[PDB]
Design a protein around this ligand. Structure first.
Ligand SMILES: *[C@H]1O[C@H](CO)[C@@H](O[C@@H]2O[C@H](CO)[C@@H](O[C@H]3O[C@H](CO)[C@@H](O)[C@H](O)[C@@H]3O)[C@H](O)[C@H]2NC(C)=O)[C@H](O)[C@H]1NC(C)=O
Ligand SMILES: *[C@@H]1O[C@H](CO)[C@@H](O[C@@H]2O[C@H](CO)[C@@H](O)[C@H](O)[C@H]2NC(C)=O)[C@H](O)[C@H]1NC(C)=O
Ligand SMILES: OC[C@H]1O[C@](O)(CO)[C@@H](O)[C@@H]1O
Length: 537
């Protein structure tokens, strides 16, 4: 028997209880600070939510501290919800968050560390004038929240966006300030979308064109584009565009308004929400954090005593083509790699299954690259309007095609009674153009009941003719993070196989298509546990 077989070995999560939205991430005085929505009283959401707090020197190993922000004034007496961190000139980290006041309305509050001598910034003080911002005119009291990190314009004026909606229309309310204390709502929103519901945890930042690095939130220029990210209808969406501080205008590169359709982009196409990013000026990279909800039942959560994970922090940058964002786990994770098992120039005949031996199958980093032969044999299927998720749910690992399904079988039992299949399929339209589909088939991930086993999928923007299809998988017990084509397509999965309570997990490479595929190269590393020290009470 294993105790708590679903807890991760190297993903961030509190000692126990409920955790959701990541909060105020930042790098200050050489220390990485991480905060998060936390319920100290249960493994479910509750009436009292506070900011958990942990620190790290590498974004991998953490030290749990006491909660940093918790109700202490009328402006946040009922709860301290999501917010962001902004380090102001003079080296002072300023935290803006949404509080639930005594009248139960969402208002924006300010707080900053009370002792900058403390490397861990344990104590925080709140501004006497909170709330600093209250719901605009035609906005309901429970539809105005999640202030972003601020950016300083050339005119020396700070800008931030706050989520919410006006008549069910998603909003990124724009506010300005020079002292960071007195904010004035700009006439028009920075951006918005019809009938999307409340825009949660908006994030607005710049990315450098033709560069795989990150930028400080206040950078601007012709060689820079901006990303407008917002969570709604259950997912985190984003759009790349141009920002004009002068007239506070954001113009979508594709001229579209978010609709939450297959027309829009997402960071991750699986369980990924309330994502928030921060700039790391030490490594010159933008790091992204995201809450990964549980997909088991509430009863299961209460029973196992905890709920909620954070995705592994990943570097974020814009693709060479400037049409989408790329994600990749921060290099520090590589230090967890132990022994390695490799494979090269290996053919996977139709309907075959190859087991990877000598790896801790429940906690590993697996990378594989496929070399395809005879693309012309690809099934004909125009995918212009096709919904990749629907397609993956319709055709799992048991649905045999020409090119596909071929990929990985993670968190699988010896008998394969339970398995999580991350694979690819290749199609072509009538004109002979190819398209690639990436799937996370969770249909057979567990034999347990009351487990959301919905599958996730997305199309990968690569040309199968000139580049091999690559796939990286972060396997960590109840979570699997899949990165297709170097990070062009990301899918996070939560799985709860039953076998984990008795026998060990297994790892496999498979090809259930009728066509042959080859593994040019495959690398698998056992990942040692990340350290989590508690320094509370
Ligand atoms: C991909 O290759 C096979 C394509 O179908 C798939 O087979 C699965 O296992 C057997 C093999 O024919 C069949 O199972 C059927 O019968 C059992 C009887 O107990 C049912 O429980 C199943 O639901 C199903 O009706 C099916 O053909 C198929 N069934 C499933 C989903 O297990 C392989 O499993 C696939 N290989 C991989 C690695 O996924
Ligand atoms: C502000 O932070 C500093 C640094 O953490 C605190 O100083 C430490 O205090 C502990 C307990 O009193 C000592 O064991 C350490 O040796 C101190 N180190 C330093 C840097 O002097 C300081 O106490 C904090 N201020 C308050 C009011 O708590
Ligand atoms: O915990 C409450 C917080 O969580 C969210 O609903 C998103 O998951 C935020 O919009 C809010 O600030």
């Amino acid at each position: 028997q294993i105790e708590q077989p679903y807890r991760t070995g190297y993903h961030f999560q509190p000692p126990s209880n409920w955790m959701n939205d990541p909060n105020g991430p930042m790098l200050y005085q050489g220390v990485y600070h991480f905060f998060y929505q936390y319920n100290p009283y249960a493994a479910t959401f509750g009436d009292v939510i506070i900011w958990g707090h942990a620190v790290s020197y590498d974004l991998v190993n953490w030290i749990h501290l006491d909660p940093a922000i918790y109700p202490t004034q009328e402006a946040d007496s009922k709860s301290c919800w999501s917010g962001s961190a902004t380090i102001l000139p003079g080296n002072i980290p300023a935290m803006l968050y949404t509080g639930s006041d005594s009248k139960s309305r969402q208002v924006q509050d300010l707080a900053w560390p009370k002792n900058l001598s403390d490397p861990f910034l344990r104590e925080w003080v709140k501004h006497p004038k909170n709330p600093l911002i209250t719901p605009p005119e035609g906005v309901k009291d429970d539809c105005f929240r999640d202030p972003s990190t601020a950016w300083l314009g050339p005119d020396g004026v700070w800008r931030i966006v706050v989520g919410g909606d006006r008549d069910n229309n998603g909003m990124a309310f724009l506010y300005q300030s020079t002292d960071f204390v007195n904010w004035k709502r700009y006439d028009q929103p920075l951006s918005s979308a019809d009938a999307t519901g409340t825009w949660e945890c908006p994030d607005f930042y710049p990315v450098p064109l033709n560069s795989t690095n990150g930028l400080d939130t206040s950078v601007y220029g012709g060689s820079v584009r901006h990303v407008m990210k917002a969570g709604f209808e259950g997912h985190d969406w984003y759009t790349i565009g141009t920002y004009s501080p002068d007239r506070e205008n954001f113009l979508p590169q594709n001229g579209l308004s978010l609709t939450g359709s297959t027309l829009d982009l997402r960071y991750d196409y699986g369980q990924f929400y309330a994502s928030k990013s921060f700039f790391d000026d030490a490594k010159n990279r933008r790091v992204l954090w995201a809450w990964v909800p549980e997909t088991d039942s509430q009863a299961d959560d209460i029973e196992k005593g905890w709920a909620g994970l954070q995705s592994f922090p990943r570097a974020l940058w814009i693709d060479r083509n400037g049409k989408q964002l790329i994600q990749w786990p921060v290099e520090e994770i590589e230090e967890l790699r132990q022994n390695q098992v490799n494979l090269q120039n290996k053919n996977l005949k139709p309907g075959s299954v190859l087991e990877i031996h000598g790896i801790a199958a429940s906690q590993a980093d697996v990378t594989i690259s496929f070399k395809l032969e005879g693309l012309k044999e690809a099934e004909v299927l125009d995918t212009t309007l096709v919904d990749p998720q629907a397609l993956c749910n319709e055709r799992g690992a048991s649905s045999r095609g020409a090119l596909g399904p071929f990929g990985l079988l993670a968190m699988a039992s010896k008998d394969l009674k339970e398995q999580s299949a991350i694979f690819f399929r290749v199609f072509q339209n009538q004109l002979g153009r190819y398209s690639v589909l990436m799937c996370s088939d969770l249909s057979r991930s567990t034999v347990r009941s009351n487990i959301d086993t919905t599958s996730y999928g997305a199309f990968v923007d690569i040309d199968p003719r000139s580049e091999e299809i690559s796939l990286r998988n972060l396997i960590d017990h109840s979570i699997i993070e899949s990165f297709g084509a170097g990070g062009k397509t990301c899918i996070t999965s939560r799985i709860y196989p039953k076998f984990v309570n008795n026998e060990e997990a297994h790892l496999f490479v498979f090809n259930n298509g009728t066509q042959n595929v080859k593994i040019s190269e495959m690398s698998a590393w056992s990942m040692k546990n990340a350290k989590f020290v508690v320094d509370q009470s």
